[PDB]
Amino acid sequence: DAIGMVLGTEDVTPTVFWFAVSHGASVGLDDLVVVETRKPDGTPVRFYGLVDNVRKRHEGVTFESDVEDVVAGLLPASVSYAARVLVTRVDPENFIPPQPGDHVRHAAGRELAMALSADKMEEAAFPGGLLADGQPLPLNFRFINGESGGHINISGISGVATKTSYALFLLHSIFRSGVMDRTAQTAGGRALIFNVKGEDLLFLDKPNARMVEKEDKVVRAKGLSADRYALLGLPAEPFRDVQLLAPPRAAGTAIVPQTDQRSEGVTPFVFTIREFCARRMLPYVFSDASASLNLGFVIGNIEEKLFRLAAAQTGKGTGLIVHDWQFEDSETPPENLDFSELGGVNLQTFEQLISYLEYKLLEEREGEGDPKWVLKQSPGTLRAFTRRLRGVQKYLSPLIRGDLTPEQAEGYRPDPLRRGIQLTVVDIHALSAHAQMFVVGVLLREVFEYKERVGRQDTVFVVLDELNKYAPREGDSPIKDVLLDIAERGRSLGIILIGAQQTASEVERRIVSNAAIRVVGRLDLAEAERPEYRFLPQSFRGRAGILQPGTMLVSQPDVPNPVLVNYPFPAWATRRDEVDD
Amino acid sequence: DAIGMVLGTEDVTPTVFWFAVSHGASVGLDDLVVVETRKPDGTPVRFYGLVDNVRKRHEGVTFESDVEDVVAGLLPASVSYAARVLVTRVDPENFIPPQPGDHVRHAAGRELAMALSADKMEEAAFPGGLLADGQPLPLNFRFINGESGGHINISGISGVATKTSYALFLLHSIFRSGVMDRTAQTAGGRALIFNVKGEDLLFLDKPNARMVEKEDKVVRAKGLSADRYALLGLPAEPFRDVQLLAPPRAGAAGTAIVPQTDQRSEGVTPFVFTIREFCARRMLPYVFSDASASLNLGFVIGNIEEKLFRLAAAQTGKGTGLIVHDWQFEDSETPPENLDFSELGGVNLQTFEQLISYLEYKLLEEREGEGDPKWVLKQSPGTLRAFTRRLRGVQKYLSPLIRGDLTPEQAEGYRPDPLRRGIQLTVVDIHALSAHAQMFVVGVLLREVFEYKERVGRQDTVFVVLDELNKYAPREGDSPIKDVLLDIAERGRSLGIILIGAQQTASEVERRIVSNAAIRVVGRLDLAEAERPEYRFLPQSFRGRAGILQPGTMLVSQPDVPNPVLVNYPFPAWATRRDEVDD
């Protein structure tokens, strides 16, 4: 149990000190070490630290050109192997230096738990990954579910850092470790995740045949005792209760999902015109936050009109029936127009709904429009609102249907909170950016409203990638607003964000600032020194530039510095090729 | 009883110097030391200081590889134990360098008083915690009650830093030390605290069932002569006079009023607001708490608040509801089948939705959509809808809190008054309520207390204990709740309103609120935040230490003493959880 001796040739301070590695021992860059010293009074003090600097030097060589002779042993010299320890905790809080010559050892048992502040975690610790030699890393669940800490934020080079895989692992850990019941001691968990990568998120229902092979290879290499999942205490199995939703293909009443390689088990999801109006979906059409005009007054006004109009609807249908649409000279044709038994037009398509908005705002009274709808708003602002609806109508029109019947509508409505479902996967990769931002906006706002009305209830995890897309640093959008609501109010409300981006400096400062858990994959060279990565010490930056895929640094409030960690291969399928018959 | 001698190998200056720790003594990083030197004419000069750096080195080892041999005794080397002193005080204020070889000693009873400027705190000193595993650290109450100082601002990582516990400890110390009596020689103490945690602050009048074992364990470990509370001189009992207020459960359609508390069903009083009082006390501005990014609704809110205030004054009845005679529903979708009508044909608004409906009618339906001209003072239609839409959006959340249905006697009993006679501590339960209701309740109570002090004068010291200060007083937003916090910060000293506020980072809080705190306490700080400009009052030496501070461990900084002082405080004598209750 001897790894080295505290060095006296370098200063020995309570925060930082060096030690010499014993012969036959190897000290890695991230190794967690404990050294115990004796006070003059005789009472002991334990120092728990992490190695941030490791070096090897030749102590007696006068010139670098004598190195060939020195290695041979012809010239007298001694190789010196030393490490620097960054103090994280002192069991007795005495800020006195350890004596040179004190024994340094790897934290392995109770010492390792003390170093990672597992005593503060208590029953709330659950596996956040693997340490150097198969020891699990305790993650304090109370800082994920909102008791004392907020959400999770993952950063790293997209394509190189494995951000989404680590998120899915954390969901697996949270769902299968039992910490939800332990911290509850309402005690359950749900997750909503969006497939935008192809069909990668679409087979996490099935076991991954390649997991065993790849697992055993790594197991034999690093010499772990059992399978990496077994070391964390987690079953190597897929997600138990999974729902796959997809958009409704492409003037046919029949509906079947846009998915190609996975066709079995996938359910189409659609919105109705009536629900569109009733549930104030209109703002989530305007996802261009990068820079724009102030349509807030127009959107709010038309939104309220549509809501009141939807509430007045007595019919059972899914479309919206309006009685004040006349076509003295509207390009729109009276044919193909569902007409009510009361002479009202029943809007069955999104393009018809925009046509009616054009009429109320721009054609109604020889061009000045219906004053109840245009509330003194300028013609230029109205037509901006109109033209943007026209621009996205083709892309949103298949997702919003009024021609569907009530049977189909109740069946196909996307509910991330459906009973008996733990993981909802919404397949948006076939949709355009406008349909993506629309669907994400509506669904997130639906979950937020529901938790506002009822309460914390079940803790709902939202796993979102490309955070810079949805919540830019400088823009302002509705979809960014619901993510702000989730970040700032989600702890108490029970909506927890597991978000990832290539760089946190491109994400809204209030989303990133509210993540209790920060996880860093391989970081770009320039990004590591940015202000948003101050929680990584300078020691880590050079290492972080070359971190291998699968390797993350996790930082959480309980323990002061980031800890490097690895995590197993997915027990679930992430592409079509990994599914047995 | 000397701990070392001034070192000549490092420069000796009046402000900063090194000393060598003598054999058999241990010198900690935050230890208070005193050194005495002698002028050539024989007069003595005393240096009171704090250690900020401490180190150990091998003096004679020529190669690092030797260490193993050197430890065995085969090679000669000596361990060099040295500490650096940051001078806080010079008692004869002669800025001369101490002479090398002078004797360094731990600060003694009287020497400790001089080092912590206790002489400046004649009798206003009260216990602020335990320092250096030793003696109580004196806190100047005159910098907390506003005679010479403002309020307290506590900062640290929520969850690990023990921020709220240190605030409650300070309250206990102020209220039991008798320092209120001493500083008097209109000299009484009151405290308002909001429970935003899950019923954590609802058991402050119950004794801590595990505070004896936990304190005892600490006493055994550090060999203290007596208990930590005993060492401070403060009794180890809970808050004596406590008021617990909670919102009403099943508020909509239920006349019976019952509090929303689940864990504690005894001694908790339900608190409700009344529609006439809402109009009379101009509480409308507090409904608009979303200052993150907002429209210029200031004129509409001001316009309606005055109209509502005048309407309340016009009421002739003693009834809680508001009576309006100018509301009609020709085409407005507000059925009157369930409504209360006055003797003179007026309508009595008993529900929050009804008040908003009346406002919607005056603003948007009164004259074929034009609206009553007196009510909308040439405000754009979009601006009126934004004001109306926000009220409808928040109506379900504030409806249980604002009731016009109750009788005057019922309302008088239920109104939440922090200044109620015979009450020293008031706890308002806000955990059940939504963020909008929470923001509305804090602003109304703070403004009512602040306004009452302005008319009456400062007859009592009201301590307002508020966590998550970034939420209520953001750095760049502008809100009514921020404005009442600003009034408390900038005018509370003379007015007697003292803010004990806590945030995870002062960087997220309004510069004026943090700048007006005379006392600054720091728990374990985030790695990034120590480098920031809001934490310049920590010397650079402290930063690396502050990154790893344990729960229970705080650095307190006050104007009388130049550098921060590391402190510990006892475990709470009051219950902070349902299981910590002692029967």
Side-chain angles (χ1 to χ4, degrees), chain A residues 6 12 17 34-40 42-47 90 92 94 96-105, chain B residues 56:
Chain A
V6 175
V12 183
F17 66 76
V34 57
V35 53
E36 188 177 343
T37 204
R38 289 279 169 180
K39 227 183 297 187
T43 58
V45 179
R46 275 195 181 95
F47 290 74
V90 208
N94 272 71
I96 67 161
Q99 259 213 357
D102 288 323
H103 285 63
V104 178
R105 50 191 191 267
Chain B
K56 281 185 179 173

Side-chain angles (χ1 to χ4, degrees), chain B residues 144-146 149-152 190 192 419 445-454 457-465 484-485 487-500 516:
Chain B
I144 299 179
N145 76 347
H151 332 248
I152 311 188
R190 267 154 172 305
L192 169 58
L419 317 186
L445 293 200
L446 283 193
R447 181 54 76 178
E448 159 173 0
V449 163
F450 178 105
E451 255 203 29
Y452 179 100
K453 287 303 178 141
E454 265 193 313
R458 73 153 302 169
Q459 61 179 181
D460 221 6
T461 266
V462 200
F463 289 97
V464 176
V465 173
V484 57
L485 280 173
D487 293 347
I488 291 178
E490 305 199 311
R491 306 176 51 197
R493 310 176 46 209
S494 40
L495 220 46
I497 310 253
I498 298 309
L499 176 61
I500 304 178
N516 279 277

